Ligand SMILES: Nc1ncnc2c1ncn2[C@@H]1O[C@H](COP(=O)(O)OP(=O)(O)OP(=O)(O)O)[C@@H](O)[C@H]1O
């Protein structure tokens with residue numbers, strides 16, 4: 333069957349922590365006062381929650397309220413435990429309160445509000461320096477959560493809030509986040525299609541923090557090459573073919589051979605044979621100002637099939653691409 337795998341960093345953070353730290357099922361939720369919050373406007377709705385802008389009437393501060401849709405208490409306590417564990421961490425969204433919504437009769441998570449800049453404007457206006465600056469900020473949040481034994485599993489642009497005026501970044505939406513336990517087989521239905529790592533696309537369940545580094549690489553490629561998304565699959569199968577058209581099929585077969593993974597036979601008549609492309613192939617007059625040899629080397633070290641070969645968040649922070657960023 334498949335060869336086992338373990339993270340090359342932060343492998344035993346959870347084994348050496350009190351069981352209360354990662355045993356989210358055993359956690360007793362402390363409930364706040366729902367009357368402290370006045371809902372102002374609906375910001376969005378997904379399969380798992382409705383999101384509102386609200387006012388905390390005890391301090392007149394703006395907050396965001398995520399009212400959870402009917403889902404397993406396992407996912408609810410997991411998100412709460414992760415948010416409480418990471419609270420105060422660099423660039424991690426702050427969970428301000430947990431209240432029972434009187435209408436839905438489900439938990440409502442109250443978060444600090446971030447005055448988020450339009451994503452389309454950010455994507456179209458970020459300069460070379462801003463891309464490096466904000467990528468260093470996201471790495472601080474990822475190294476923190478990884479060092480705390482947690483994988484985010486849904487890194488994507490909509491989950492990175494940026495207040496471009498105050499040069500403030502927050503990593504949000506921890507509903508898919510999970511505690512990393514060496515040897516544990518996880519669900520591969522995580523992350524959004526365009527940001528799914530090859531490990532999820534080939535059904536390899538013993539993955540780790542390095543999944544987030546693939547997702548970060550996908551964001552980087554889309555920003556420096558001005559191609560959103562970078563890997564534009566029609567579905568989860570075409571998603572792997574789109575990756576293989578860039579990284580090539582030889583390295584893909586070496587990856588699956590290393591872990592003794594057998595690809596779904598449905599890939600036999602869609603994967604083809606592709607060579608690895610040089611990153612310069614994606615450079616053109618409209619994105620050249622965002623590309624440098626340091627950007628391409630950094631990208632090359634994130635976008636690797638073998639999850640064990642990708643840079644960790646801390647190694648990424650050491651890369652020459654960030655030497656220009658004021659620290
Ligand atoms: N802490 C926050 N401060 C300000 N706005 C937030 C905060 N958290 C979420 N939002 C905003 O709430 C809105 C709705 O969120 P929601 O996650 O449902 O949709 P979304 O960002 O389009 O996500 P997805 O792409 O996953 O569907 C978004 O515009 C999001 O930026």
Ligand SMILES: Clc1cc2[nH]ccc2cc1Br
Nearest residue numbers: 454463466467470489492
């Ligand atoms: Cl790190 C980062 C996160 C982001 N979220 C939306 C745009 C955007 C750009 C960068 Br660079």
